[PDB]
Design a protein around this nucleic acid. Sequence first.
RNA 1: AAGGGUGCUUGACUGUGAGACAUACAGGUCGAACAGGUGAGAAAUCAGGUCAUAGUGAUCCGGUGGUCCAGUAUGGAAUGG
RNA 2: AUCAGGACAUUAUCAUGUAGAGAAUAGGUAGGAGCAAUCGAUGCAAGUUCGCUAGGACUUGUUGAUGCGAAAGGUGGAAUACUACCCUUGGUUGUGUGCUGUUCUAAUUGGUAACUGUUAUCCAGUUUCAAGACAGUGUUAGGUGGGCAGUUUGACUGGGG
RNA 3: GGACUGUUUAACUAAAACACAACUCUAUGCCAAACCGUAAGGUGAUGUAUAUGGGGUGACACCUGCCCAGUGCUGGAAGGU
RNA 4: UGGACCUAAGCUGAGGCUGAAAAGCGUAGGCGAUGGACAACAGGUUAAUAUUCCUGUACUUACAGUUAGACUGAUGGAGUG
RNA 5: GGAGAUGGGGAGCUGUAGCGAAAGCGAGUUUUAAAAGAGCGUUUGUUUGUUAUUAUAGACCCGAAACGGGUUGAGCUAGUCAUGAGCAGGUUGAAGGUUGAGUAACAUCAACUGGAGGACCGAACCGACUCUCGUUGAAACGAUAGCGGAUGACUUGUGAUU
RNA 6: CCUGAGUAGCUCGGAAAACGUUAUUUUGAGUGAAUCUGCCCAGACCAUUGGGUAAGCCUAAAUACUAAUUAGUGACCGAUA
RNA 7: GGGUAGGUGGUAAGAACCUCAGAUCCGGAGAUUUCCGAAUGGAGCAAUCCGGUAGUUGGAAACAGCUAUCAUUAAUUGAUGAAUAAAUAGUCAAUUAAAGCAAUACGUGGUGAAGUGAAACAUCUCAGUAGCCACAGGAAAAGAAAACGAAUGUGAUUCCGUGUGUAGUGGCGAGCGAAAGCGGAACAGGCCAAACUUAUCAUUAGAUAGGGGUUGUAGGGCUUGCAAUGUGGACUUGAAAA
Lengths: 63, 145
Amino acid sequence: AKKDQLTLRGPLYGNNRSHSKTITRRKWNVNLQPCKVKTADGKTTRILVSTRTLRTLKKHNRL
Amino acid sequence: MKVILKQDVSNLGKRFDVVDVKDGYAIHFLFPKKLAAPLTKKSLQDRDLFLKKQQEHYEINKALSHKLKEVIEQTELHFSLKEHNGRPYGSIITKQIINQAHTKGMALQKFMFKDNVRLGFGDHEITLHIFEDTTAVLKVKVTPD
RNA sequence: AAGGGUGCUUGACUGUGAGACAUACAGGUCGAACAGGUGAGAAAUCAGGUCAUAGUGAUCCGGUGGUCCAGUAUGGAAUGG
RNA sequence: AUCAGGACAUUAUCAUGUAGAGAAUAGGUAGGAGCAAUCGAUGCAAGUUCGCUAGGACUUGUUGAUGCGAAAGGUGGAAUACUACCCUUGGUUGUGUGCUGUUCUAAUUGGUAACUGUUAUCCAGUUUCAAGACAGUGUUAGGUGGGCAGUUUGACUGGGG
RNA sequence: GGACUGUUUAACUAAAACACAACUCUAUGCCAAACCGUAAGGUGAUGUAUAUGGGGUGACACCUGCCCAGUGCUGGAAGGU
RNA sequence: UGGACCUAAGCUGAGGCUGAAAAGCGUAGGCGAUGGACAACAGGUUAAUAUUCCUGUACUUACAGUUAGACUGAUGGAGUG
RNA sequence: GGAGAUGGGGAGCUGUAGCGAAAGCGAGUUUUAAAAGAGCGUUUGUUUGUUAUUAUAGACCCGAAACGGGUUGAGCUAGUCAUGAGCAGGUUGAAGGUUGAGUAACAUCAACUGGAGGACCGAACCGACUCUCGUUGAAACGAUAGCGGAUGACUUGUGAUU
RNA sequence: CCUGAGUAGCUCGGAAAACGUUAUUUUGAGUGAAUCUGCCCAGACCAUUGGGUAAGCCUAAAUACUAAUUAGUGACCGAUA
RNA sequence: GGGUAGGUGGUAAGAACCUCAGAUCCGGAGAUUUCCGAAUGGAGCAAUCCGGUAGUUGGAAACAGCUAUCAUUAAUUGAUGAAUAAAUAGUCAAUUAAAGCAAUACGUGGUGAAGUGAAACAUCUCAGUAGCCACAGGAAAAGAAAACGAAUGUGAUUCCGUGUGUAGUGGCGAGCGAAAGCGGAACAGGCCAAACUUAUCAUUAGAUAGGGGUUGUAGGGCUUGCAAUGUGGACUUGAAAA
């Protein structure tokens, strides 16, 4: 699906307005980038990841 | 992200210490030549631990580099060509040289290589900047059909 | 003459207002009289816009001045009153 | 990741610009009338520069000691020499960031090919090639946008308009 | 009037209508442009400008006249916003 | 006549890519005839069935033994159909 | 506590003091300089059985074209794809080619072959142009009779197809 | 000495809470800490005071209902109900 | 086990007869259950067609019966191992789960409508309802203060009533509608990191286990002594009574 497999962090389907206070259904899709993840003893096995989870991996020296 | 550098006099030459220009996922942390270390303890415990690590890796890494340089300089590598009409038709790629290196039993990193393709007609050998001090020629025997 | 020109003049006041007319609601119209201090006049007294009637738009909302209003515990402030 | 131009910063930095005036860059207010002289020749030749061409001189390997006549008389919309700051025009500077233009790839993309899983036109892994920090995107915010959703579309009226 | 075979409103209307062959414009160098969605993916096409997409008229022959002042579109980025 | 054989239009879907779940698509395998392949005719039979019931004449392929020759032929490859 | 009245249960009221937006004061309070004037207030209290009205709930009863969400139908009357079949009969006889004359040669002339056509008339096989018929019919769309195409962009079975 | 990291906050878009986004919860995008002498709340923010120890995990009970066996109960209806 | 004089489910007409070696009949425990059917060997147009392996009796065999067995995924284990040595991807074998149904009643979350009402209507309402999706479990859910809140106030959630139709917000229209304090029903609090320590992990700790700990009258750990043989338990077993 449109979610990183590292954790279940789903998107949003919320309410969008304008300069009339009218309500419509808008689809908040989170950022996705298929960066190469690193695990134990090689086997990168590139998977689609989200930018926030990318930064969290970066701050833990896990790429 | 880290501030740690490792085993290089090249790449904006500096001292064998902790220093890094803070810019995202740039080459300062894209290479296996700069280890991402935890800076939360990099004051006194990770400090002397990294000093010991630096000295140890210094010693063992130049030891292994001398060993591999001697191995390369004392061993010549072999391919086999498949041409047609007998006229020069093939070449040499880095994938097959890495595979022949794997045949001996080590996974050499690409960071010692600067070429992309080589002419495979007749004897051909190239000396590349393998490491900061150790230099060796990749002697390969190649002949047409 | 409540019309013409004369000196001064800004009662083209403040808080009110028993009372009436008109009138479904609104709102509208006029006014005695009281207190405060005023200008005209020697004084009597007068002056709460125009000789009279058209010269008008509701709430809410928005911020402008003053404020013996409060100030999500206290102190102010914000904020509203 | 790499710099060339590159604009703000103009770290430092040395001369400052002939206003009616002033012999001459008083550029403005000030204790004001010296030892400023190891912050010192009046020839070299002038880099320049103020360029109102002299002028100011910051300028120098053959000179080690000039002295200020421009300080009190002279001009004035402000006085000439030991201290503080002001439109210090800019040669300059550490580069912090922004504009491009190029130089690469390891980020990232491919629907170029080969090999394998696999006798499998999709995917998986690499290697080239194509590209390349642009895009493809995900978010924010502008501009266009009846293709698309809802809408109001006044009343009286010898009928309605 | 339409050029013509022909086609479709069945259960009120097939005609002068739609299709045309024949032209004129106009977007396109591949992952074409466009089209379907939520995307993958797919047609376009296992196609390459002498090819597809979309306009207008409509065999054949002769003519297609004047107007970017207003909207659509193209170039600019000098100047304002 | 079909299934025990194949496959066109499509369906299914181990794989696997997209989507909030639903689901969409897409490989290999597997399905799906109107078509591809072939070895029974005649007569008679009882009220109803007749190439299927009966009389005569045939053919078909699976195997054991049997003589008598030959070394053998695929999931792979070319033609054929 | 019988699917009971009822008992227990001291939460909040409804008045008992009201004015002023409130602060606040109080048989007074506010506008106010104001005690003046003026606006208000000077004790009729509770809980129920009830009739009539009423707000909210579908709200006296029944009567629309609707909007959205699904779910379904390509079998017929539409197109597409795959896969088959059908078109009796008689005409018209194009081009190409061949043969002789000619052309420097090709083009031209005459004869032979030829079968071409969104070719013709007319069977079937599709269509419905018309006068009547019936407008509760034989028939929720046809019948007699005349009309068109009739080797094509035609009809059409069987599968899927949106 | 330990007291729960893209975690609290902050910025641009929303919602829940009665609220139409305001203190408190949510991150959709980003930036991002402080570690008891601390760090958050008392409908903005600070100073004082007071109250808490988030950013780790489970636990039912007062409550929701009757398709399911008997006890049965109806000022429920009587074959157009 | 009870109960036993009738019985062969209702259209009972009767043949055949069963039944007092205690039946027919009412419960407990059972056994065998054809095919489709979540459907699982594969197909398929449901109640159908072809199957493979293993063992079996018959024959000389094709074959016939007679048994059992053969989906897919995830996890564990083991084996095997492509591109290109190991590695990794795949490839197979054995083992554990549902994968499915329903109670139109319930609950969570992901979702998610308008026509209406405002006498029209786009803001609000319509309502987080109508419909859809997943997960369920018999109850679900939440559940232990960074709560509240304004006072030496309570101290895990819940509901009922009251506040109160108040506080409020609202093209301040139609409207919407709380949080505290109160009465009551049952009302249990626990657990893991985490410093620090032992053994085992290849100490490039980035892993198993003995502790240790749940904390605001700040606690726990660290160094060092007294106690104490405790009470609780939502919780493992068996035995007995009811």
